[PDB]
Amino acid sequence: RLTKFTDLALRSLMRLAVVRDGDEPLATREVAEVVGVPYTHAAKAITRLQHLGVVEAGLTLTDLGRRVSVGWLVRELEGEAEVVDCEGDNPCPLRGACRLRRALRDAQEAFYAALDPLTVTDLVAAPTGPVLLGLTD
Amino acid sequence: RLTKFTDLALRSLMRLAVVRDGDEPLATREVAEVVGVPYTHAAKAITRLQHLGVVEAGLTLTDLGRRVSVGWLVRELEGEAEVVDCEGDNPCPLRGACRLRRALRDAQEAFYAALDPLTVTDLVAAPTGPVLLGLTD
Lengths: 137, 137
Ligand code: SF4
Ligand code: SF4
Ligand SMILES: [Cl-]
Ligand SMILES: [Cl-]
Description:
The structure is a homodimer.
Chain A: H1 4-17, H2 28-35, H3 39-52, E1 55-56, E2 60-61, H4 63-67, H5 70-78, H6 99-113, H7 120-124, H8 128-134
The structure holds iron/sulfur cluster (2 copies) and chloride ion (2 copies).
């Protein structure tokens, strides 16, 4: 499962990607209302996207924002989280001699590689882009 | 992220896969001690694996248990959970016109397909199988 935070960050970028140059740099508020979350959640997401350099401005998508891959974004946004936790409160005795762990690393790489060919631009092509714009009508 | 329950079910199968024919059908207890969890957690996992038909017996791996793919097991064990929740407490307005959702479906399929070539047999090949047996020494 992907984090709510990761998905929401992606939603926010999608919303910023449909801004027709010379429409308006959106406020965080407008973004949060349109993508259907509270302000506070959207606020976190935007500040992170600013940390990453994919947004700036009033808010805008950067040169970088348009061209980065969705794979890269998810990798960055997922941050620390791993596919499995081999040492939580009760750490696993197979740690370090685990063939399953290796397989899950390969599987998780397959996941990100399926997303490397896409950009946010590709995600706001139709039908999605129109619906976002539709939601600001 | 994979569920603790899914990983633990896989741990339990791995433990059952190293039983040298005519060693001993393990009790749930022995499995839970060896894979490093409480009895109650292991108990759930085993009953599910019995529902799926990959274990039986005193506990044993079935004919089916040896040959099923790790991909199939994870798909079954993950059950209901989806890659993203497009309708939780605050459902997403992009539902049904979301290019991101489609991409994440492709990504998640890439994840399982990386695991389709493996079986539990492949996971308890070395170094893992020896360590499990080592943990019953
Ligand atoms: S069984 Fe393997 S992947 Fe699962 S927690 Fe243990 S070391 Fe990690
Ligand atoms: S942005 Fe797309 S994938 Fe994310 S919750 Fe909304 S419909 Fe689902
Ligand atoms: Cl490893
Ligand atoms: Cl869909």
